[PDB]
Every structure is written in structure tokens, then in C-alpha cells.
Amino acid sequence: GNMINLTTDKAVYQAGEAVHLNLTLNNTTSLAQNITATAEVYSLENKLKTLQYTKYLLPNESYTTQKGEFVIPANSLANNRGYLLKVNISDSQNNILEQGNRAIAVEDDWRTFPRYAAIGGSQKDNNSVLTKNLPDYYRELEQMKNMNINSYFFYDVYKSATNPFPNVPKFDQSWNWWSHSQVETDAVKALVNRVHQTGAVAMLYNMILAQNANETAVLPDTEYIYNYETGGYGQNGQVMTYSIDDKPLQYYYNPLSKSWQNYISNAMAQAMKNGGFDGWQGDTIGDNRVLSHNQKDSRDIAHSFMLSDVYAEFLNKMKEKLPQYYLTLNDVNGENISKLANSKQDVIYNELWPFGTSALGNRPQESYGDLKARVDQVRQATGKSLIVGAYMEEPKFDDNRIPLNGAARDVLASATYQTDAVLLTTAAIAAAGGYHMSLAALANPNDGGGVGVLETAYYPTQSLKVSKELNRKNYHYQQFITAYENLLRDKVENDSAEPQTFTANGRQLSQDALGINGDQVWTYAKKGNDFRTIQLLNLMGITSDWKNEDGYENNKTPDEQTNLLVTYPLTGVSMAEADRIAKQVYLTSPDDWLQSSMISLATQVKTNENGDPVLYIQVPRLTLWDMIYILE
Ligand SMILES: OCCCCCO[C@H]1O[C@H](CO)[C@@H](O)[C@H](O)[C@H]1O
């Protein structure tokens, strides 16, 4: 990495707010000398500012800049944009001693460009949320802050589905039968307060229709929902019940019940106000065909309805009854975007599994291309950037602790998460215009002082270690995703123009623009108002499965490429416009060779048989992910 320790006072900024930076100048030399920190402020390719500070330092002496010394004043940056701070530390000979880049996010609120992370109890402490772990939480949240995280998903900090956050000092989570976790409410409040200090929001996870089965009913049975057919929630004409091993765990209420709507909204309002939360991260147990209480005995299918057919109305009622609060509902596998397109969700959140049906058609949602397709489907239906839960690897064991997958064999060997696997999944979602909710503050020692990576639905579980390599590249990836949000997900659509990628020696590397096959440089274009982009995702010599359930048994580090050619056709553009464009082609990558820096590319303008111009773009390097940026 570097030792610049580049830090900002907040995670995110209002346009009318100053950015206070701190940075550390390290005289890593044997010579007493002026050490210079130069921080260039870029808005895409354009250098807006150079900031600069010099301090005379003795050998091995360091100096951290004080409040006021590096600042970007209020009203310096346009609103709802990402920026990059490109820092070089230099000695009195103009040798570069170190370099590090940091994004700056300026935005009204988190809804335009969500960058969402999880917070959850500590595995080493029964999954509890405890005051004694605040130091580790705060350390993780300092890191997420400098990664520009703007929102936080508080997972399993609730007492019960119907009493989510009572004003008591500590409560048991009695629905936790595996580890009997507890929550100290002062811990959750301190967490929320710390999130707020960074400019970020705190979302409370809770079900929307549920009550825990061993608590008195909050409403009488006229409000319950009933099964239309016998299945996994019990018998036709019985209350929809979630059970494990013939013990009822949860009962469900009718989304159309006005009394349930008023109950749960007010219960959430109170819970949220108790914690200082900013909104509701909603969840449902799964879809079902159901009957209202008064229809419970009907065998007439036309008297029944799919719960998902009423989610939009239910949500709209929640918004209306919770107007100052953010609202979203996890749509598992993204099955219902057309149903939910007009609901007043503030953000779209889909938890995606490899076994869901792809937005592509009749195939599992198993590859990087399937993640893009779902991101695009959401964008098309709502205009919003999809937040994706795509948990990585998920080691699983049988009863003899026999591994049921390769990742589980890595667990037995005390191995790490496969760094490039995680990064390629985050790249696939981001390059498509979405955001991979992957990062977690879990006070978990397998996270080695850094932030965790979500591996399973039960967020507190960390079976594999986060290498310092993964920690450091995750940070680079977050800066890229922030600094280039206006190119990735701000009125940017798929482009019908078809870019291709070649080596210097005759191979076409781009083979399947859908991203469903591996062993290729996955290459596709996007189109914004005055630009185009080309995403290059390196899958040379690797498979396209995003989850990497095999762990290290399936290598996910793709074959590094050098001196590639990318062609991009300029159908119907004149030679003079093409020549202007050809001088305005740039590249950036979150990978170590650039760490979000942008460079100019050598480009030639050629034509087809009919005088139609085509850019021939030289790409120095591709490690995992490159973005070409074409001003047009
Ligand atoms: O979209 C479906 C997500 C919910 C799946 C099961 O969740 C439930 O069960 C989980 C444990 O399996 C709990 O951690 C959680 O609080 C509770 O809501």
C-alpha cells in the first residue's frame, strides 16, 4: 500500500461543505530534507486543483498535516459527483517516495449512488452486539469511512420482528437458537452515532410481515395470511408459518391488513427513533400463494393472490406512514422488479444466488454476465442503480465436517478468501452500473484488523481470513467505484456499438459480450451524455462463475495482459469528430498499476470499406478491470 494514511473528516460531502484532509509526509530517507505532498483534485480527466504542502523533515521523521492545511473549500465541487485525489509524496530531488489515491463523494444523499456496507454481531461472542467490541467496530468504520461508504445495513440488531428495538439496556434475541446472541442497545446507538458522524445513514433490518411464533399475537387472526396450497409453509387453510424441524418459528400477516400496516409501521417508527436509525432494510421470508382470513377455506384460485403482487402496495403504504425514512425491500433473486418498479423504494436491493433464474433468460444466475443483466434490468425498469447482495464462496460442511465444496476445504486449511474472486464479482456489478454490498463491520478476528467480506446470508459468519492483500484492493476498488460513479452509473446506458479486444499477435480475446463464458477479456460499451465507456473484465484462463464455491481449487486470478488493442466503431461520426475523439481517449483501473489514476491512450482512427471511422486504442495493461473513457 502506502503510509500516507490519507484521511477525510467525513465519508461523504454536501456541495456546500469543505473537505478537510489529513495526510502524512514520511521522510523515508537517510537525508534531512524538504518532503513534498502534492494532492491533485481531478474530476474525471480534468485536473481541477493542485494542493501542495512541503515540510522539512529529519531522517525517518513523519508529519501529519493539521486541520486547515489540506482543505477543499465549500462550493468548490459540483454536486452529485465523484472526484479523485491523486497524491504523490516527493523528496527534494523529485523522486516519488510514495503514491496513493482517494475518492471524494459529493452528494445530496445516498440514493443516487448507494455504497452500502453491513454491520453485525461478533462471531467470537456468540454473534452478540456488545459494548466491549466498540473499539474494533470503530476501527472498521474508520476504514469504511475512508472508503466513502454512505449507508449501513444493521443486520440482526433487532429484539423481535414485532418489537424491533426497545428502550432497554440489553435484550436477548430469543429467535437465535444456534448461539443465543444478545444486544446491548448502547452499542447499537454508539454505532449509529458513529455512522452519522461520517455523513452516512443507518438502516434497520427487519421483516415486513412477520411475527415470532412464541410471542403473543400482536393482532387477532383476522389479520393473518393463510396458505392456498399445502407446502413448505404448512397446510392449505392454515396460517402461513415458517418452521424448522416441526417447530414454528414465524407467522405471517396479510400485507393488505390495514391494522397490520399501521402496527408494523408504527413499531418500526418507534424502533428507528430509539436507535437514531434513518430507515428500514426490509426482508420477507419468500413468496407464497395465499388467502385472506375470510377466504381461508376457499379452494378457488381466483380468491387467492401472490404475496409479491401486493408488495408494491404494502411498500407504498410504509413510505406514506414513514415519510422521513428510507425504505427498501430485499427482492431475493430479483424475481419481482416489474412488480416493484413503481413502488416508492428509495433504493433497489436484490440478494442474488447462483440458482436464481438469470435476467438473461432460461439459465441460472451463475456467471458475471448474469449479474450485469440483473443490474441492467433494474436500471431499465426504475432508473436506479441496483445494490446487489452476492455473497462470496460460502464454504459449506456436512455433519462430519466433510466439505461440501472447495471453499470448505480452504476453511479446513485456514486459508483466506480468494482475493481475485471477490474483486471480480465486485468489478462485474460495478462496471454494469450497480454496487456490490460486500463489505462488513463484524468485530471479527478473521478480518485481520480490516473489514470483512460477506460469505453467507448470516452476515456475522467469517470462516475464511481476509488477506491484507484483499483488504488493500477492496479499498482501491471502493475509491474507483466512487471516483468514477458519473461514468459507471449516472445516466449511462448499454451501447449497441460492439467493442473488441485483441492481443498484439492475432488473437481476438473478446468472445462473449454477455459475460457468460470465461477465458476471455469480457468487453462491452456503455453510453452517457457526452461520452462512451468500454469495460474490460479480465477472464483470460478463468471461469465466469461469480460465487467461486470451489475456492482455491478453481483459480480466479486471470492471465495478466499487456499491450492490447481495443476497437470501437464510430458509426456515422465524421472523420473530424473521430479525430477529436481519438485525442480524448483515457484509461483508468482500480488495480495496483493505476489505483484509479487516469492515463491518455495512444489511438489511431481507421475506417471500414465505407469510410466509417473506427478507433484503434492501445491498452498498456489489464490485471482484472480496466475502464476506457471516450469523450464524445
Ligand atoms: O429474504 C430472506 C432473508 C431472510 C432469511 C432468514 O432470515 C431470518 O433468519 C436468519 C437466520 O437464518 C436471522 O439471522 C434473521 O434475522 C431472520 O430474518
* CATH code where residue 396 lies: 3.20.20.80
556 shares its domain with 609: yes
CB 35 within 8 A of CB 89: yes
**From 212, 285, 350, mutation site for ligand 1 pocket: most ligand atoms within 8 A of C-beta:** 285
For a mutational test of ligand 1's pocket, the pick from 212, 283, 391, i.e. the residue with the most ligand atoms closer than 8 A to its C-beta, is 283
Listed residue (154, 167, 133) closest to 201, CA to CA: 154
352: amino acid identity, one letter? L
Strand pairing class (531-538; 521-527): antiparallel
* Cα–Cα distance measured from residue 389 to residue 510, given in angstroms and rounded to the nearest whole number: 28
Is residue 77 located within the same domain as residue 130? no
Whether residue 179 sits in one domain with residue 305:
yes
At 192, list the grid cell. 449509529
Considering the domain architecture, whether residues 584 and 621 belong to the same structural domain is answered as yes
User: Number of folded domains in the chain?
Assistant: 3
Give dist(CA 199, CA 196) in Å, integer: 5
CB 283 near ligand 1, within 6 Å? yes
373 in Cβ contact with 360 (< 8 Å):
yes
Q: Which residue type sits at 118?
A: A
Please check whether residues 561 and 588 belong to one and the same domain. Answer: yes
Which candidate, 106, 117, 157, places its Cα nearest to that of 141?
117
Residues 464 and 348 in one domain: yes
CA–centroid distance, 242 to ligand 1, in Å, is 11
Element at 443 (helix H, strand E): none
- Out of 439, 470, 490, a domain closes at 490
Q: In this structure, are 192 and 247 located in the same domain? A: yes
Q: Are residues 504 and 604 in the same domain?
A: yes
Between strands 279-283 and 151-154, the pairing is unpaired
d(CA 185, CA 158): 10
Query: CA-CA distances (angstroms) from residue 417 to 119, 428, 466, 547?
Result: 19, 18, 6, 11
Query: CA 387, CA 427: separation in Å to the nearest integer?
Result: 13
For residue 331 and ligand 1, the question of a CB distance below 6 A is answered with no
Report helix, strand or coil for 463: coil
What is the position in ligand 1's atom list of the atom closest to the CA of 459? 14
Distance 437 CA to ligand 1 centre (A): 17
Q: How far apart are CA 161 and CA 284, in angstroms?
A: 11
CATH classification at residue 587: 2.60.40.1180
> CA 442 to CA 456: how far, in whole Å?
13
Domain with 596, as residue range(s), is 491-632
Q: What is the DSSP track for 471-538?
A: HHHHHHHHHHHHHTHHHHSSS-EE-SS--EEE-TTS-B----TTS-S-SSEEEEEEE-SSEEEEEEEE
Reading the block at residue 587, the C-alpha cell is 484509461
In this structure, the answer to whether residues 277 and 324 fall within a common structural domain is yes
For the record, the C-alpha cell of 381 comes out as 425498469
User: Same structural domain for residues 525 and 563?
Assistant: yes
Question: Which is the closest atom of ligand 1 to the Cα of 283?
Answer: 1
* CATH (domain of 49): 2.60.40.10
Residues 130 and 42 in one domain: no
Q: Which three cell numbers stand for residue 115?
A: 455504497
**Residue 349 CB-density burial (10 A; 0-12 exposed, 13-18 middle, 19+ buried):** buried
Tally of CB atoms within 10 A around 96:
11
Domain check: are 106 and 187 in the same one? Answer: no
End residue of a domain, out of 490, 522, 548: 490
Reading the block at residue 209, the C-alpha cell is 410481515
Q: Is the CB of 118 under 6 A from ligand 1?
A: no
Helix (H) or strand (E) holding 579: helix 575-582
- The one-letter amino acid code at 515 reads G
Contact status, residue 131 vs residue 186, Cβ threshold 8 Å: yes
SS3 of residue 630 by DSSP: strand
Rounded Cα distance, 427 and 372, in Å: 10
Length of the chain: 632
Distance CA 382, CA 280 (A): 20
**Cβ-proximal residues to 544 (8 Å cutoff; 6+ apart), any chain:** 367, 368, 369, 515, 516, 517, 518, 522
**Is residue 333 within 8 Å of residue 353, measured between CB atoms?**
yes
